[PDB]
Amino acid sequence: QEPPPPPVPLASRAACEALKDGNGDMVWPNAATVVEVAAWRDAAPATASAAALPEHCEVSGAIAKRTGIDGYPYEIKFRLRMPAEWNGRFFMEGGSGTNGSLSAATGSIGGGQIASALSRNFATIATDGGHDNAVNDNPDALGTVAFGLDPQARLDMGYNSYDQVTQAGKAAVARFYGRAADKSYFIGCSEGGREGMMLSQRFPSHYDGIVAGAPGYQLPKAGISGAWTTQSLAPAAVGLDAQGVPLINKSFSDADLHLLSQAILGTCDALDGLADGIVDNYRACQAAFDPATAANPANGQALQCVGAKTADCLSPVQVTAIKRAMAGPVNSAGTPLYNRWAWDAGMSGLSGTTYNQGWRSWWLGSFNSSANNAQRVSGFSARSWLVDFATPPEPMPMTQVAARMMKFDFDIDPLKIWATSGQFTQSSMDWHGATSTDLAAFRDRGGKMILYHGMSDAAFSALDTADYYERLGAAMPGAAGFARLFLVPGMNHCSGGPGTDRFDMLTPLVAWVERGEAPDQISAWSGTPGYFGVAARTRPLCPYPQIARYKGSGDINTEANFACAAPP
Ligand SMILES: [Ca+2]
């Protein structure tokens, strides 16, 4: 990487193939880098779901092949694509879930977009985070979360993998093109959004522009919320699963959640000036809505049943349950362990005859099942907390996860995300958390960050991202000059819901970093406009704390008739 280049033309098939082990003398930043593929790829035409891919060099391999203390093989996989015709920009996409998979690495920009970064002639890279869902699938350690049994695999998942992969990709770019990238960009959602915030705090010089959507920047606390919502909803459950755990998925039918959503709309929709099915004034909604006293606007009666349950009311047990779940977990002293959640119409939604599953899948699960299947009851999120974030890890059969969430002790078990034990020398909050508001180094070198978060996200609370942004603004006056937050009413986790959940985040990110154009609004459209009975709906996303306000005339489904403003 330092020695003279191979005597072949740059940005060519020959320069591409010379990157493979034994085909040249490239020095990688990590001496344990093994290139397994270095292949020239012809241009690929556009498809119904993807933009055309230019002719490029594809490089894939692994870093730091080793054996974990669990006896499993571990390595950091990467896939890199460098177009023959390059715009001089470097791009890394974020992960999802607990990672463990290696994407096509064409540079996803999220927001339901058809275009990839590679389709825009970026050089693009992706990683699996340091473990492999096919290899590190341990049936005694809850499946694909099994990497949590190895301390180094935890560190790789928290920060080290993306650091190693960023360095390797930049080194390959400089060799293949003969020059370093002019600017580097990172875009991720969920776990990928946590990765973006981590990079801005831990490795500020890695990327110049960062998009962090629905960022799990306190991901080790998600399982604490999950135990809380599970125990809060259990009194409203009907029936038991095969292990005797109440069926949390039966606590609310789809029709029940739509009643809740409609009551929220009755209380909150017009607080922004327009009864359009979207709660733009989320702060005013949180101050006004209480399902224990709110009305069902369709029958004019209280949402909470006075007597027996009917299709038009929610039982007092249901109302108590969802209120407690939305309040957030606390210890015996009443101290919050995570954050509270915003009431929003995207908890439900109806398009044709299809009820929105995008909110309820996280805490409740699908209603039509005799087993628990929520992410937070027995699913991936609960499993990840036990094996990946609790220290020491707590492997167990998948049949026992839901019962463990039911017996979760909020004075004892939350401490496990701050603890170390034996060879686990860092806590999960140490290696996975990204809570720092010290972004001076990132800002001072020209870094720009766009955050976004759907209000009806049940994985991570949009209000918790807002609280981080408030802390950032207090710690760094003038923070809006380099970091802005775009909350999306009605939107669920990274996509979906009765809101404008689709948007091109890369175009304004490049404009901010390279031309100094801060995003005063970001255009967005609904992927499911049927939620509003219309063919399309476009709206501006507004920088926190602004919200969209109707101008008073014109099509309510047209972005041009809205502007960003402070709440009324
Ligand atoms: Ca409204």
SS (H, E, C) 105-141: CCCCCCCCCCCCCHHHCCEEEEECCCCCCCCCCECCC
Angstrom CA distances, 361 to 216, 317, 377, 379, stand at 17, 20, 10, 10
190, 261, 461, 526: the active-site residue: 190
What value does the CA radius of gyration of the chain take, rounded to a whole number of Å?
A: 24
Helix (H, G, I), strand (E, B) or coil at 453: strand
Rounded distance, CA 131 to CA 237, Å? 36
**Spatial strand order in the sheet of 483-488:** 33-41, 56-67, 73-83, 123-127, 89-93, 183-189, 209-213, 448-454, 483-488
132, 280, 457, 464: the active-site residue: 457
Question: How long a stretch of residues is the chain?
Answer: 568
The rounded Å distance from CA 566 to ligand 1 centre is 14
Rounded distance, CA 90 to CA 87, Å? 9
Cα of 127 vs its chain's centroid, Å: 16
| 453 among known catalytic residues | no
The rounded Å distance from CA 274 to ligand 1 centre is 4
The dihedral sign for the CA sequence 472, 478, 482, 485: positive
| Structure determination method | X-ray
Task: Point out the annotated binding site.
Answer: 97, 191, 269, 272, 274, 276, 278, 376, 381, 493
Task: Point out the annotated binding site for Ca(2+).
Answer: 269, 272, 274, 276, 278
Helix (H, G, I), strand (E, B) or coil at 292: coil
Helix, strand and coil percent figures for the chain, each rounded to 5: 35, 20, 50
Closest of 364, 537, 341, 376 to residue 456, by C-alpha: 341
Resolution of the solved structure (Å): 1.8
Lookup: tokens for 468? 């981080």
Helix (H, G, I), strand (E, B) or coil at 27: coil
Total number of domains in the chain: 1
Lookup: tokens for 422? 């034996």
Rounded distance, CA 72 to CA 61, Å? 18
Contacts of residues 466-469 at CB distance under 8 Å and 24 or more positions apart, as own/partner, are 466/544, 467/339, 468/217, 468/435, 468/437, 469/544
Q: Which residue has the tokens 């599953």?
A: 357
Rounded distance, CA 148 to CA 141, Å? 8
Q: Which amino acid is at 70?
A: D
Closest of 222, 63, 215 to residue 145, by C-alpha: 222
Rounded distance, CA 18 to CA 57, Å? 11
Rounded distance, CA 313 to CA 360, Å? 18
The rounded Å distance from CA 462 to ligand 1 centre is 18
Q: Which residue has the tokens 């989320």?
A: 282
Closest of 121, 97, 128, 96 to residue 107, by C-alpha: 121
Lookup: tokens for 72? 């499993």
Rounded distance, CA 430 to CA 418, Å? 8
Rounded distance, CA 147 to CA 138, Å? 8
Rounded distance, CA 333 to CA 278, Å? 36
Torsion angle of C-alpha atoms 49, 53, 58, 62, degrees rounded to 10 = -30
| 208 among known catalytic residues | no
Closest of 229, 239, 238, 232 to residue 309, by C-alpha: 238
Closest of 133, 131, 125 to residue 89, by C-alpha: 125
Angstrom CA distances, 312 to 235, 260, 298, 302, 349, stand at 20, 10, 9, 9, 16
Cα atoms in the 13 Å half-sphere on the side-chain side of 488: 31
Rounded distance, CA 26 to CA 444, Å? 33
Rounded distance, CA 259 to CA 407, Å? 30
| 432 among known catalytic residues | no
Are 144 and 133 spatial neighbours (Cβ–Cβ below 8 Å)? yes
The rounded Å distance from CA 266 to ligand 1 centre is 10
Q: Which amino acid is at 552?
A: G
Q: Which amino acid is at 328?
A: G
Contacts of 501 (CB under 8 A, 6+ apart): 111, 112, 454, 488, 490, 491, 492, 495, 524, 526, 527, 528
493, 495, 501, 526: the active-site residue: 493
Counting beta carbons within 10 angstroms of the beta carbon of residue 407, is it exposed (0 to 12), middle (13 to 18) or buried (19 or more)? exposed
Closest of 465, 495, 220, 486 to residue 341, by C-alpha: 465
> In terms of residue numbers, what domain contains 60?
1-568
The rounded Å distance from CA 355 to ligand 1 centre is 20
The rounded Å distance from CA 278 to ligand 1 centre is 4
Rounded distance, CA 189 to CA 176, Å? 29
Do strands 209-213 and 183-189 pair parallel, antiparallel, or not at all (unpaired)?
Answer: parallel
Lookup: tokens for 405? 């969430």
Angstrom CA distances, 38 to 80, 82, 375, stand at 9, 11, 38
Rounded distance, CA 369 to CA 173, Å? 50
The rounded Å distance from CA 282 to ligand 1 centre is 10
Helix (H, G, I), strand (E, B) or coil at 236: helix
Angle between helices 161-177 and 191-202 (to 10 degrees): 80
Q: Which amino acid is at 348?
A: S
Element (H, E) at 296: strand 295-296
Q: Which amino acid is at 141?
A: A
